[PDB]
Amino acid sequence: RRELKLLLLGTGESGKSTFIKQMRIIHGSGYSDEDKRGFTKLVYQNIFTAMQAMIRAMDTLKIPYKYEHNKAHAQLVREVDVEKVSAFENPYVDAIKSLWNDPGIQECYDRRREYQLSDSTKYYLNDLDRVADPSYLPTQQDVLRVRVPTTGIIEYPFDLQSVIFRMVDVGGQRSERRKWIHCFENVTSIMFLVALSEYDQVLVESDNENRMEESKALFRTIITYPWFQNSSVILFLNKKDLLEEKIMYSHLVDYFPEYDGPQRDAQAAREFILKMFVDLNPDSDKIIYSHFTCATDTENIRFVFAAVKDTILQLNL
Amino acid sequence: QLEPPTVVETLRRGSKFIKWDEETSSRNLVTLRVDPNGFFLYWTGPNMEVDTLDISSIRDTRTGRYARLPKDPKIDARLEEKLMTVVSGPDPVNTVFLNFMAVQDDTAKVWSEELFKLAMNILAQNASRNTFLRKAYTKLKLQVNQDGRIPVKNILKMFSADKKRVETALESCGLKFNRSESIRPDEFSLEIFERFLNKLCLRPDIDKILLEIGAKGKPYLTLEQLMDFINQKQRDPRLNEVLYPPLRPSQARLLIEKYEPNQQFLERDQMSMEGFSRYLGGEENGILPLEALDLSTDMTQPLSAYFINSSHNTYLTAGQLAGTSSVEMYRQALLWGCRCVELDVWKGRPPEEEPFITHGFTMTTEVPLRDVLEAIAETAFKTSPYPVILSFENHVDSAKQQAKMAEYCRSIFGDALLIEPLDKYPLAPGVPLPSPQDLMGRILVKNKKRDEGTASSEVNATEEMSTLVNYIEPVKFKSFEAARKRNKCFEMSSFVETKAMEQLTKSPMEFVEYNKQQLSRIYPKGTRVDSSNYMPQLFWNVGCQLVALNFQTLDVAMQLNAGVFEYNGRSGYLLKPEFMRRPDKSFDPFTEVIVDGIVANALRVKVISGQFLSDRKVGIYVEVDMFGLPVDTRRKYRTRTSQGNSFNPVWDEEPFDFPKVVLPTLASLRIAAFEEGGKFVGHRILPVSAIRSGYHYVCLRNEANQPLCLPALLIYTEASDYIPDDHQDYAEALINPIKHVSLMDQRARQLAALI
Numbered sequence A: 001r002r003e004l005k006l007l008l009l010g011t012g013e014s015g016k017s018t019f020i021k022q023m024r025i026i027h028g029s030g031y032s033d034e035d036k037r038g039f040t041k042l043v044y045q046n047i048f049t050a051m052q053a054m055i056r057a058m059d060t061l062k063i064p065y066k067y068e069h070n071k072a073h074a075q076l077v078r079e080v081d082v083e084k085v086s087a088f089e090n091p092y093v094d095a096i097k098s099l100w101n102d103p104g105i106q107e108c109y110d111r112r113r114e115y116q117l118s119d120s121t122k123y124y125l126n127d128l129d130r131v132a133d134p135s136y137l138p139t140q141q142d143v144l145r146v147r148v149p150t151t152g153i154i155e156y157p158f159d160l161q162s163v164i165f166r167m168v169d170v171g172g173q174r175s176e177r178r179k180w181i182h183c184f185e186n187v188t189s190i191m192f193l194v195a196l197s198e199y200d201q202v203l204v205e206s207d208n209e210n211r212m213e214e215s216k217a218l219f220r221t222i223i224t225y226p227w228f229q230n231s232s233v234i235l236f237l238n239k240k241d242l243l244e245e246k247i248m249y250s251h252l253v254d255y256f257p258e259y260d261g262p263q264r265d266a267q268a269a270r271e272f273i274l275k276m277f278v279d280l281n282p283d284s285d286k287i288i289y290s291h292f293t294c295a296t297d298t299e300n301i302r303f304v305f306a307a308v309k310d311t312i313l314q315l316n317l
Numbered sequence B: 001q002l003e004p005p006t007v008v009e010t011l012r013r014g015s016k017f018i019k020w021d022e023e024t025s026s027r028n029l030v031t032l033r034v035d036p037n038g039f040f041l042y043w044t045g046p047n048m049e050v051d052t053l054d055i056s057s058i059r060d061t062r063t064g065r066y067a068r069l070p071k072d073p074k075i076d077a078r079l080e081e082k083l084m085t086v087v088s089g090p091d092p093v094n095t096v097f098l099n100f101m102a103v104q105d106d107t108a109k110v111w112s113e114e115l116f117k118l119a120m121n122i123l124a125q126n127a128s129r130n131t132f133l134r135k136a137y138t139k140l141k142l143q144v145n146q147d148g149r150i151p152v153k154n155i156l157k158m159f160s161a162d163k164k165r166v167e168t169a170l171e172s173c174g175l176k177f178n179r180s181e182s183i184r185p186d187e188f189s190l191e192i193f194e195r196f197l198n199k200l201c202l203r204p205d206i207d208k209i210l211l212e213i214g215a216k217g218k219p220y221l222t223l224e225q226l227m228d229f230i231n232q233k234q235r236d237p238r239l240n241e242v243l244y245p246p247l248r249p250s251q252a253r254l255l256i257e258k259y260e261p262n263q264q265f266l267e268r269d270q271m272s273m274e275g276f277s278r279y280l281g282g283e284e285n286g287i288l289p290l291e292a293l294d295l296s297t298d299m300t301q302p303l304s305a306y307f308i309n310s311s312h313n314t315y316l317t318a319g320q321l322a323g324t325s326s327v328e329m330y331r332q333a334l335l336w337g338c339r340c341v342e343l344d345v346w347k348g349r350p351p352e353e354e355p356f357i358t359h360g361f362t363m364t365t366e367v368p369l370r371d372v373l374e375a376i377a378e379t380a381f382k383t384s385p386y387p388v389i390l391s392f393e394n395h396v397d398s399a400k401q402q403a404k405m406a407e408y409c410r411s412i413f414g415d416a417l418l419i420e421p422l423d424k425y426p427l428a429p430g431v432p433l434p435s436p437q438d439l440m441g442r443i444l445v446k447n448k449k450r451d452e453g454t455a456s457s458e459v460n461a462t463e464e465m466s467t468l469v470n471y472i473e474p475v476k477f478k479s480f481e482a483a484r485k486r487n488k489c490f491e492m493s494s495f496v497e498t499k500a501m502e503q504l505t506k507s508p509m510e511f512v513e514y515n516k517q518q519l520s521r522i523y524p525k526g527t528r529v530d531s532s533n534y535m536p537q538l539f540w541n542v543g544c545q546l547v548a549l550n551f552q553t554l555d556v557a558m559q560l561n562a563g564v565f566e567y568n569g570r571s572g573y574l575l576k577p578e579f580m581r582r583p584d585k586s587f588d589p590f591t592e593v594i595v596d597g598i599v600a601n602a603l604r605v606k607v608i609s610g611q612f613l614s615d616r617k618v619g620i621y622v623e624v625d626m627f628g629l630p631v632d633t634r635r636k637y638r639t640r641t642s643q644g645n646s647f648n649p650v651w652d653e654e655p656f657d658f659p660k661v662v663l664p665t666l667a668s669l670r671i672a673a674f675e676e677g678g679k680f681v682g683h684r685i686l687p688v689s690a691i692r693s694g695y696h697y698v699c700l701r702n703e704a705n706q707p708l709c710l711p712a713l714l715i716y717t718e719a720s721d722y723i724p725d726d727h728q729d730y731a732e733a734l735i736n737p738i739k740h741v742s743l744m745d746q747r748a749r750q751l752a753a754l755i
């Protein structure tokens, strides 16, 4: 069968592995009750990881716990070795429920831009009851939200009848990019993910360097490499849901000063970030097919990829 | 997960016991106990002079019915489950037995089990350089004389590498140095042993590392210089920054508070040359991450997706032609992690309705089949819970005995014996072979169902021995196209080395294809009458799972076998690379080039120095070999024979470079130390994909992979992700792209004047 090889490239925490899950849901073998059961542990770990990061945030940012009884719950959670968490029970459940209700921890959640905290924090912490229940089965939306850092090079083939796409998921962190050269042979298209929400964030690799500045430089660089002179480039401006919310209180002009668009505007901010990636590229060769995506929204990816499928095929035969 | 070896209060305090062999006349009562660290089993006899057994040299502990008994001496009844036998030795053949019948009853069991856990503990075998030194010290403190003193002549013997300097070191600490004098345990502390080592063993090699980076204002080192060192020089560059975060200031402080002796440097967050020496040989600066030595491999893939520790004519102790056959070799093989033993069975005598085991028409002693079966059900899952294969080479010309042969299998193995297929894996085409996880605590039988040696003429397959064969049903191999057309994962075929070699050179990719769904067993040729071994790496490279060897011959073949099967919890099952498992994929094992979707590595190995490598003053040289694909193999490198000593030799020789490792995930580094002449000191087998970067002590091992104590080497490694010769620019641009796009935007901004 006709087999074409796509690459999922991105900075790191952009949504490459999440895009892969939507492919497994849309064109793949989806997620059964047993598959889902394979994530419970990971959803329990993400909640601990997140509440531990916010517990460090309280000291680092010197924020007082509104309530005294939360100082104890904070010491109970901070001691847990996430790598061994296989269950989610009392006292831990009532301790994380109580920490999340502490105006002090809420004041710290609001300042998440000031430290590293995953995007699926609020999604999970606001649904603890459903997650704590001893009859808990992760929903498909629950699987699409989990955080599991990707390291190395993983090939996922998908049969779209008409064609078979061999999608390659990789690690985004700087150290992971030294490996990338080992999946550059015979590439048809490179689909690049950028986080629209990371315009006011810093790298986990380096906390004085701006995330969107990183993805911007990585994109402008990678499209001028010789392995890709005959390979199409689809740019997915992902996390459009997180930009809609954040843009309301985190002004783009404060991180990118050449933005002369209005504030508290999701679209003007959106179309400015697209220009930076595609425009005035001294190496303005390839046409770049862009798409605004929310990778945890199955119906969005279904529609977007149907279009990227057509584009890739055409620009080949 | 893994645990440090805790020594129960009973083994600490001690319990009374009677030590005996087959010659002992009088009742010799002794108090057995284990030091708090679980290094030595020690008992003080009649003379009051002590005897020590290294707990890391222990191979098995038996009790109840599996324990040794005598006769002559005698002690009435038999239910005396207070018999305990300790089996130790430096390889499966040279086993030594110690018997200790308990005085109180409910104790021998507790001991037998506790000693066993301590003896097979992973952290104990993979301990810090500091711990092996603290172990040496413990031996000097236990092996006291009849007057509870430490004989000076024991310190001269332990370091007979230089007796003249030893005298100067002891004298420098205000300790006795004369060969007639003794030292009181009270004035021979760990403090004064570490001081003793530091004045005897000058370390210009460590001086050169403190100067490296940095502090030329040299007496000490700063918290930052140490954090930057652990994070930059000692960190694995292949590891993800999120998965393996670097040390913080708060964590670098704990290290000074844990190792710095000078209570004044600790105050000013600084570390001394003595405090850095402690860290280099601490438990955070091991050559390997715990994840490598742990049972962390996925154990749910089909049985065909794994390399399996295997044995050839297990029953042999020496050569093939003539020699003795044993029941004990099975126990030793299985306890060592072996998951595939061979029972070359012959037919029983008329009056004596009992079939025996031996080779063939060779005047080689024979053992009863029934005695081999029991020895297997006994040891099969003591050191591993993963499945065991019984390779049957049947020569039974009898319907009765072959039936009585099946009867023993059901009788002795019971519920463990897999007699029928699993509900989930029916013996139909297209179905895959079960998980090792799916067959935990199971005995699978490999026999016929209805210079190759005695493997070229087996008898017919009767219904009794045919009704036990299910997932490992051997069949006449035709081609790969046939086994493929047929599509049966439960159908496996053996290949005598030379036969396996032809399929290796002619159809290597078709051989890998086959090994993704069916099992293949390789066994040495009938010519190797000295139970010689072939290099298993040849057949692993084509995905061969059951690559049997002669466990009685510790040549480089078995040393490599024990080396690689120490990993994955000694489970006896290693998961094959992804591109040697997936139907989707295929590559040429003879590829002289990198392979798309596989991350190649570069390895630089520099031999820096060695410590206490021999009891006699002699020159030392170290070999650094790499086993894996034919392109990834190098059995070449060798340092020059040391200065002239064996105490603290330093080597100044460029690093041994392995610039391109196509399949690093299948490569194993080998570091072997030798004396001028070829006398083997010790070695170590390290997986290339796990071996860490920077200065790390390599705690040496014997041919059997048992941990030596004093011998060690300080090596410097750089295990990195491979970057072609020219793509070094594009690599750096992908890693820190902002710097790259910062210059091209700067230059452009500087040219705006001239449009």
Ligand SMILES: Nc1nc2c(ncn2[C@@H]2O[C@H](COP(=O)(O)OP(=O)(O)O)[C@@H](O)[C@H]2O)c(=O)[nH]1
Pocket: A010, A012, A013, A014, A015, A016, A017, A018, A019, A118, A119, A120, A144, A145, A146, A147, A148, A149, A150, A171, A172, A238, A239, A240, A241, A242, A293, A294, A295, A296
């Ligand atoms: N809200 C939101 N979350 C997302 C989106 N895409 C990814 N995420 C989340 O961000 C985290 C990182 O996703 P992942 O695919 O692992 O990042 P990768 O390293 O780029 O693979 C996961 O928890 C995802 O659920 C998005 O479009 N919207």
Ligand code: ALF
Pocket: A010, A011, A012, A013, A014, A016, A148, A149, A150, A151, A170, A171, A172, A173, B242
């Ligand atoms: F954010 Al990643 F591998 F791309 F964990």
Ligand SMILES: [Ca+2]
Pocket: B313, B342, B344, B393, B453, B454, B455
């Ligand atoms: Ca044989």
Ligand SMILES: [Mg+2]
Pocket: A016, A017, A149, A150, A169, A170, A171, A172
């Ligand atoms: Mg990823």
Ligand SMILES: [Mg+2]
Pocket: B230, B234, B235, B284, B285
């Ligand atoms: Mg380290």
